[PDB]
Amino acid sequence: MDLYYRPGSAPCRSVLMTAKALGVEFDKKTIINTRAREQFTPEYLKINPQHTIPTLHDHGFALWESRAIMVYLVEKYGKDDKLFPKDVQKQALINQRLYFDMGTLYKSFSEYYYPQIFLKKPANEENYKKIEVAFEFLNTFLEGQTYSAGGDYSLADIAFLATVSTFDVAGFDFKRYANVARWYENAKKLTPGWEENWAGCQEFRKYFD
Amino acid sequence: MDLYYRPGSAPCRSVLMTAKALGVEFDKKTIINTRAREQFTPEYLKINPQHTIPTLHDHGFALWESRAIMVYLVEKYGKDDKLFPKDVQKQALINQRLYFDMGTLYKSFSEYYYPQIFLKKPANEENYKKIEVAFEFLNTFLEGQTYSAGGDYSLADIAFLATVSTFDVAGFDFKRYANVARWYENAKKLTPGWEENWAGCQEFRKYFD
Ligand SMILES: N[C@@H](CCC(=O)N[C@@H](CS)C(=O)NCC(=O)O)C(=O)O
Ligand SMILES: N[C@@H](CCC(=O)N[C@@H](CS)C(=O)NCC(=O)O)C(=O)O
């Protein structure tokens, strides 16, 4: 399979960490230059008409949305289902956390930072408050819990690691969210794809310089 | 099980349509008054600390995020898996469309309309353009396709019906998106929960008056 991605991109990094966790290798890895509008070529649009990254191309099957890709990888290539168990309630909790990561947590990241880094607009107080609301919820989810979505490390932890590490490299101070801070330091240690993720975070950090 | 919801709410309506499709009855249905901040009671926060609707409470298991609830209902209570097949590639396509519905399509709805209806702010041109971008993508997804996420009617069609019907009742003109318009008229006919959804849309419409 071919992965179309950028190393700096959080949704790409969640996919990369998942592949590492599963021992999956991508036979082709292609960095898409979005500045050069490489995602708008007729060839790319034929694979993914939404012209987004990450995009996976697996023997004529095309897939996008990072969190859809993460579940697909576990279901198709996982030697076990530990990261996304077949148990309906376990899966549902992980799914809720994945939608939270997209719709609340990472959404707060992009809505606060993207206008500054890409449109040179001033920092917005209301958008910052939404980050804080999102971290408060995550901090609550993690109260008395080692992992973010059940008794075991799961896809939710990978997704949150990609997002929270982006906040980290952006300089968002989350020290006061004690459960988040504790979860984060622990999860790093359990994630074989952590180096690669943090290296990508360093690439993303260039947008601030 | 108990459903906490509002009839006007699109993510609630997607859950309601799913229950109808599956022949699922909720033993308790509770309308949450969000104006009266009923979601902030200690009792509600104990079930769902994110204080959102829809929330499902199923024998001590609490679940939120509409699209997580939709999959949970099919997996736990479905007499078959037609709406969310076990096939890994079929599921992945439906999952991508569900994330699209949350992160692109319904996101464009709330970001354009909510500031007007709730904060009395003026209509924003950039936010309207994002609606159009989202409908263009959906129109492309539907090119030569009867349904939105595979050869059969699925959870993706239910999710999109909840979202597109909200656009409809809000007065967003999507006639020019020929595939969307065609898909919409057809999908209504195949959806046993359509009346209830459209009735909820009428309740939501009161925010414009
Ligand atoms: N919700 C998507 C987000 C993907 C996304 O918006 N990727 C960005 C880069 S971080 C992108 O492809 N932008 C280029 C474009 O849309 O044309 C996911 O989780 O995969
Ligand atoms: N992404 C969520 C959205 C749920 C949501 O934001 N619901 C609104 C009503 S439409 C709500 O509970 N607002 C009250 C609050 O958050 O306090 C889903 O799909 O279920």
Does residue B51 sit in the same domain as residue B62?
yes
Do A70 and A95 have their domain in common? no
Of B44, B78, B112, the domain-final residue: B78
Within this chain, do residues B159 and B176 fall inside the same structural domain, yes or no? Answer: yes
CATH number of the domain that residue A49 is part of: 3.40.30.10
- The interaxial angle of helices B155-170 and B66-77, nearest 10 deg, is 140
Cβ–Cβ under 8 Å, residues A131 and A171: no
3-state DSSP call for residue B35? coil
Let me know whether A67 and A90 are in one domain.
no
Do residue B138 and residue B174 come from a single domain?
yes
Number of domains comprising chain B = 2
A57, β-bridge pairs: A2, A62
Spatial contact of B76 and B41, defined as CB atoms under 8 Å apart: no
Q: Which two tokens stand for residue A37?
A: 């509008």
User: Could you count the other beta carbons within 10 Å of the beta carbon of residue A96?
Assistant: 24
Residues with C-beta less than 6 Å from any ligand 1 atom: A 9, 11, 34, 39, 51-54, 65-67, 102; B 99, 103
Contact A72, B92 (CB under 8 A): yes
Q: Is residue A63 located within the same domain as residue A110?
A: no
Residues A89 and A162 in one domain: yes
**Domain-ending residue, one of A78, A111, A144:** A78
Q: How far is CA B105 from the centre of its chain?
A: 10
Here the CATH number for the domain that contains residue A120 is: 1.20.1050.10
The residues that bridge with B55 in the sheet, in sequence order, are: B4, B64
Same domain, B99 and B39: no
Residues A28 and A90 in one domain: no
Q: Are A22 and A73 in contact (CB under 8 A)?
A: yes
The per-residue DSSP string of B122-154 comes to: PPPHHHHHHHHHHHHHHHHHTTT-SSSSSSS--
Say which residues have a Cβ less than 8 Å from residue A209's Cβ, sequence separation at least 6.
none
What is the DSSP code string of chain A?
-EEEE-TT-HHHHHHHHHHHHHT---SEEEE--TTTTGGGSHHHHHH-TT--SSEEEETTEEEE-HHHHHHHHHHHH-SS-TTS-S-HHHHHHHHHHHHHIIIIIIHHHHHHHHHHHHH-PPPPHHHHHHHHHHHHHHHHHTTT-SSSSSSS--HHHHHHHHHHHHHHHHT---TT-HHHHHHHHHHHHH-TTHHHHHHHHHHHHTTT-
First to last CA, chain A: 34
Bridge partners of B57, per DSSP, are: B2, B62
Nearest Cα to Cα of residue B193 among B2, B1, B7: B7
| Residue B23, both tokens | 């022949």
Joined together, the tokens standing for residue B73 give 């209902």
Strands B2-5 and B55-58: antiparallel
- Asked if A137 and B50 touch (Cβ cutoff 8 Å), the reply is yes
Q: Which long-range contacts (CB under 8 A, 24 or more apart) does A109-117 make?
A: A109/A10, A109/A163, A109/A166, A109/A167, A109/A170, A113/A170, A117/A207, A117/A208
A137 contacts B67? CB cut-off 8 A? no
Please state, in angstroms and rounded to a whole number, the distance separating the CA atoms of residues B111 and A130: 14
Whole-number Å distance, alpha carbon B53 to ligand 2 midpoint, is 5
CA of B60 to the centre of ligand 2 (A): 21
Of A75, A88, A140, the CB nearest to B72: A88
DSSP state of B27: S
Specify whether B31 is located in the same domain as B99. Answer: no
CA of A34 to the centre of ligand 1 (A): 10
The domain of B150 spans 79-209
Q: Is A110 annotated as a binding residue?
A: no
Q: What are phi and psi of A117, to 5 degrees?
A: -75, -30
Residue of chain A minimizing CA distance to B95: A68
Q: Which of A22, A53, A72 to probe the B interface (max B CBs under 10 A)?
A: A72
Resolution in A: 1.6
Computed from CA positions of residues B51, B55, B59, B61, in that sequence, does the dihedral angle turn out positive or negative? negative
Q: Which experimental technique did the depositors report for determining this structure? A: X-ray
B31-70 in b/e form (b: 16+ CB < 10 A) is ebeeeeebbeeeebeebbbbbbbbbbbbeeebbbbbbbbb
Query: What Cα–Cα distance (Å) separates residue B194 from each residue in B17, B81, B202?
Result: 7, 21, 12
A75 close to B (CB below 8 A) = yes
The CA-CA-CA angle for residues A5, A98, A117, to 5°, reads 50
d(CA A207, CA A101): 22
Q: Which residues of chain A lie closer than 8 angstroms to B50, CB-CB?
A: 100, 104, 137
Amino acid at B66: S
B106: nearest Cα among B137, B142, B150: B137
Cβ neighbours of residue B60 closer than 8 Å, sequence gap 6 or more: none
Residue B91 sits in the same domain as residue B62: no
A9 in catalytic set = yes
Q: Are strands A55-58 and A2-5 parallel, antiparallel or unpaired?
A: antiparallel
Residue B29's nearest CA partner among B65, B49, B56, B52 is B56
CB-based contact B2:B29 (threshold 8 Å):
yes
> Which of B78, B100, B133 is the last residue in one of the domains?
B78
- Cα B209 to Cα B158: distance, rounded to the nearest angstrom: 27
Q: Do residues B67 and B96 share a domain?
A: no
Strands A28-31 and B61-64 come out as: unpaired
Nearest to B30 by CA among B56, B10, B48: B56
DSSP state, residue B156: H
